[PDB]
Design a protein around this nucleic acid. Structure first.
Ligand SMILES: O=c1ccn([C@H]2C[C@H](O)[C@@H](COP(=O)(O)NP(=O)(O)OP(=O)(O)O)O2)c(=O)[nH]1
Ligand SMILES: [Mn+2]
Ligand SMILES: [Mn+2]
Ligand code: NA
Length: 327
DNA sequence: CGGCATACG
DNA sequence: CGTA
DNA sequence: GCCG
């Protein structure tokens, strides 16, 4: 088992679901308390279990697995022996965890805002609604639309949504393309949102594209919320439903075709996979990776990539298709 | 012990 | 600060 | 919380 998640395939479904879910609760709790290091270790341990070829049945099977020390091993031990980890259950039922989860789930609220609200004594969505002058416009949208945004987006919704985005994109710039990224590209059947990456085959033609796309979607009556030169938009869209509609979160990102492989790689995720890939790049290869490119800080040069395959090769990693990036 | 990804709105 |  |  290699130590970085980008060095091993991680499928969407696996053989240690219960164990990984428990470790991810502890990760989430760590994040709520501002401990990014502990969040990372718990996420990485969870991901290791996702990458295993069969279920862990005995504690000895954790011996020599990366990211399993005393704490993570004890969590697994208790789950294997009793079907439940007391620490995890204590977290699940803490007022602190439940409220931080509720608040951070709101579009426009992060850990820092949630924590302040918690310290101020606020606990429920109706608590926030009763003092709305204190909310940003983004948070007001997030709170108004919270119920719809809490409903999973279905893979069967994505097709009709991509069609409307393509129509707007084609008027904004003929020849521009729309590629489905995010979790759906990794094979997820549901999502919290839909992520689309937009480019044009002629380098430079994509400049100024996103405002044009957004103004057109807005004129079609499809945009319940967006922030508005820019290249990423975090929207709430009106999606048709039987006799009605629902609000869904849609992310649009534009990249030049030169950068498209890097943007596709970054936006396809998973989040942990990309963190691990960027960590690997810098720490093991001395190269700086982001969603725009891959920089050699010695040569002061950028790697031209024509594909995701190119990027994996340049980093000395075996290629993983999107379905095996579910770290 | 230091480090923990790296951007844009 | 929020967001991916 | 863990690797390195
Ligand atoms: O902090 C982040 C968040 C997202 N990303 C990348 C990876 C992620 O898979 C992708 C899309 O982000 P989403 O928040 O939409 N998550 P995803 O599509 O993987 O799952 P879902 O939308 O179902 O929660 O953007 C990062 O690199 N860093
Ligand atoms: Mn997504
Ligand atoms: Mn998204
Ligand atoms: Na949030």
């Amino acid at each position: 088992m290699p130590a970085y998640a980008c060095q091993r395939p991680t499928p969407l479904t696996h053989h240690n679901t219960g164990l990984s879910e428990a470790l991810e609760i502890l990760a989430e709790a760590a994040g709520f308390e501002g401990s990014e290091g502990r969040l990372l270790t718990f996420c990485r341990a969870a991901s290791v279990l996702k990458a295993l070829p069969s279920p862990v049945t005995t504690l000895s099977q954790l011996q020599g697995l990366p990211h399993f020390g005393e704490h993570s091993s004890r969590v697994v031990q208790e789950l294997l022996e009793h079907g439940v980890c007391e620490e995890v259950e204590r977290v699940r039922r803490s007022e602190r965890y439940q409220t931080m989860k509720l608040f951070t789930q709101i579009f426009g609220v992060g850990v820092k805002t949630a924590d302040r609200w918690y310290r101020e004594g606020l606990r429920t969505l109706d608590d926030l609604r009763e003092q709305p002058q204190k909310l940003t416009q983004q948070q007001k949208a997030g709170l108004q639309h919270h119920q719809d945004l809490s409903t999973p987006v279905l893979r069967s919704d994505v097709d009709a949504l991509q069609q409307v985005v393509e129509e707007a994109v084609g008027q904004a710039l003929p020849g521009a393309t729309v590629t489905l990224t995010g979790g759906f590209r990794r094979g997820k059947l549901q999502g919290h949102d839909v992520d689309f990456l937009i480019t044009h085959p002629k380098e430079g033609q994509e400049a100024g594209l996103l405002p044009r796309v957004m103004c057109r979607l807005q004129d079609q009556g499809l945009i319940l919320y967006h922030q508005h030169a820019f290249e990423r938009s975090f929207c709430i869209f009106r999606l048709p439903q039987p006799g009605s509609w629902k609000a869904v979160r849609v992310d649009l990102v534009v990249a030049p075709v030169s950068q498209f492989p890097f943007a596709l790689l970054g936006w396809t995720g998973s989040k942990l996979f990309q963190r691990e890939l960027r960590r690997f790049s810098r720490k093991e290869k001395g190269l700086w990776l982001n969603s725009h490119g891959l920089f050699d800080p010695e040569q002061k040069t950028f790697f031209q990539a024509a594909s995701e395959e190119d990027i994996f090769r340049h980093l000395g990693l075996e290629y993983l298709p999107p379905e095996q990036r579910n770290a």
